[PDB]
Ligand SMILES: Cc1cc2c(cc1C)N(C[C@H](O)[C@H](O)[C@H](O)COP(=O)(O)OP(=O)(O)OC[C@H]1O[C@@H](n3cnc4c(N)ncnc43)[C@H](O)[C@@H]1O)c1[nH]c(=O)[nH]c(=O)c1N2
Ligand SMILES: Cc1cc2nc3c(=O)[nH]c(=O)nc-3n(C[C@H](O)[C@H](O)[C@H](O)COP(=O)(O)OP(=O)(O)OC[C@H]3O[C@@H](n4cnc5c(N)ncnc54)[C@H](O)[C@@H]3O)c2cc1C
């Protein structure tokens with residue numbers, strides 16, 4: 095019998111596993127996939143660390159969190175500066191002067207601001223939908239070329255058919271600066287993410303290719319306490335219904351050339367282009383090989399049983415989640431954590447913070 | 460047509476079978492297993508009588524019961540004195556001065572009593588769980604070393620997530636004495652338990668490898684009365700649901716050495732070790748052979764259909780049993796007995812007393 099049974103070997107489960115075993119507790123980690131790491135998992139393909147479940151760029155404003163992850167790796171100086179392709183046009187992300195000079199053929203911050211403000215102001219009443227919402231935030235030109243088609247692919251319907259709540263803010267900076275994240279600490283682990291999980295899970299017993307739910311009673315009996323980082327609704331047999339998600343599908347391709355797109359991340363904002371993004375993984379670690387691996391990111395219509403990527407978090411799903419959470423609060427020695435256990439989108443720094451806080455309260459002697 | 464159809468050849472079934480045949484009644488015994496004896500069954504393996512379904516040590520304070528079993532066998536003078544292994548440590552059971560001197564490095568009865576009674580007092584309220592219940596009775600040290608891990612494995616969860624009712628009492632004696640049982644009569648039948656059942660069932664027709672419920676039609680009106688020692692809920696097709704049990708799995712191993720652990724019963728009381736006990740069977744009859752048969756005893760998850768070892772006997776299941784008991788009181792010419800027929804843990808002596816009392820009223 096173990097001290098802890100941990101379901102899932104992602105960032106939350108692995109950090110807890112590491113912290114618990116460092117304090118002398120025994121941990122059994124049960125993982126359904128054929129590998130560890132969760133959605134942060136990287137696979138070495140043709141000497142390139144491939145972000146299998148989408149681009150993962152670590153960033154934080156918390157030095158303690160940054161220092162924590164540095165125990166397991168060294169971060170390079172990768173700066174995310176994504177490119178957006180719209181039909182035959184190409185723009186810099188995030189919305190900055192590089193974007194604005196290209197869009198309108200202007201040069202000064204005042205020129206850009208004048209156009210942004212005049213275009214935002216065509217909306218003179220509270221937005222009735224997502225289209226009016228986005229326009230009220232950044233104006234028509236930015237919306238049509240950089241937001242509209244991309245969003246309609248992600249959601250599978252017109253922005254006029256979508257609620258305004260989906261986009262709360264759209265930051266604009268009047269500086270020539272393509273730095274996507276404003277955080278002081280940013281980078282990619284040298285050697286990939288998976289090696290971090292190897293270190294975290296070294297003192298744990300890890301079982302792969304095993305769905306905990308297919309052996310629920312068997313595994314519960316193997317430990318005194320359970321940390322579940324899978325879907326909370328799935329743990330409770332979806333008895334109240336499945337918490338709604340949006341999904342994705344990645345098509346990975348090995349290409350016989352050294353440099354496909356010249357940047358790690360390219361957004362395709364035209365609705366007629368089926369993929370939302372193309373990821374060229376070698377640029378994450380400044381790779382110098384004669385071949386490259388790219389991943390085409392496709393929206394995938396979600397239903398129960400399909401990979402849960404982005405939680406919806408609307409009112410009805412939050413109400414549903416609170417019902418499951420109430421079940422959880424009354425099940426002693428079973429704890430739910432992570433993006434799936436708490437039905438929320440966690441940045442990596444957010445789950446590190448969440449995991450460590452749980453560790454501080456849970457782990458004693 | 461037989462006088463009696465007896466389902467099960469365990470202690471209850473076999474005693475009734477003996478008494479009935481002795482008084483000139485015809486008895487048909489239907490047993491689902493490949494052999495007789497029920498859970499008391501011993502198998503001769505490498506000239507060692509192996510207790511196949513767990514260590515079975517007969518004991519009683521009733522001379523009558525003891526004298527009754529002596530009709531079928533002779534008991535040796537085996538004294539049960541289990542050893543408890545916790546991590547790198549080793550202790551004597553039951554809780555006595557040998558235990559206490561090892562635990563605390565003390566020597567006198569009063570030195571031990573002072574510690575135990577001081578440690579017991581950290582629980583000032585009614586125990587909210589099994590952990591507090593154990594601690595309230597024997598203190599933290601005894602609980603952590605000899606009860607905690609052992610219990611966690613048996614139930615698959617922490618003791619503070621278990622009800623206090625699981626442990627009724629934990630006797631403590633301030634004497635240097637490793638005698639596990641306080642009974643004046645105790646021992647192991649020479650030649651094994653199976654030989655006893657052989658004698659009891661000699662005048663009965665015995666059918667093996669036959670699940671009565673599975674083939675109930677094949678035994679329609681083949682006897683006037685039925686004595687059922689199987690599960691009472693199973694007899695009634697689980698009309699109200701299944702009575703809950705805990706189960707066990709034994710891994711029997713043969714080793715080429717004369718003495719594996721130097722005692723019949725070793726309890727493993729830390730949760731890390733998967734088995735709860737290791738039984739070295741040759742010590743029950745003071746074996747002298749050059750090989751030994753041991754059995755690792757594992758707690759096994761119970762669902763409906765799994766071998767029923769220990770009844771839960773909580774409120775939910777007692778309410779369930781009472782429903783089935785009421786059905787039985789209206790079932791003409793059918794009687795239920797034994798641990799399974801009555802959903803109760805019985806010592807062997809209890810079954811003998813129970814069987815004979817039924818024989819008194821029926822025969
Ligand atoms: C498309 C996309 C892209 C990114 C990101 C998310 C998404 C959806 N993230 C967020 C990042 O992925 C996230 O922080 C972690 O996955 C969270 O770690 P967890 O342990 O919470 O879950 P995660 O989903 O990683 O791990 C859960 C694990 O549990 C397992 N599991 C589930 N059910 C099971 C079962 N029944 N039995 C056994 N195992 C089971 C799963 O297989 C999985 O391994 C990110 N963050 C950031 O800071 N920068 C970034 O660039 C990105 N990019
Ligand atoms: C692990 C363990 C350790 C024990 N240790 C001791 C001990 O040290 N000392 C002690 O005094 N007692 C001990 N006991 C108690 C003890 O074994 C009982 O007293 C004894 O088993 C009771 O006999 P019984 O006939 O009532 O039940 P059983 O012995 O189980 O007899 C029942 C028989 O009926 C059969 N049966 C069930 N269903 C059907 C069916 N549908 N068709 C045909 N046959 C069926 C079974 O196969 C079985 O053969 C222990 C019990 C266990 C479980």
Ligand SMILES: [N+]
Nearest residue numbers: 590617618619
């Ligand atoms: N406990």
Ligand SMILES: [N+]
Nearest residue numbers: 608729730731
């Ligand atoms: N233990």
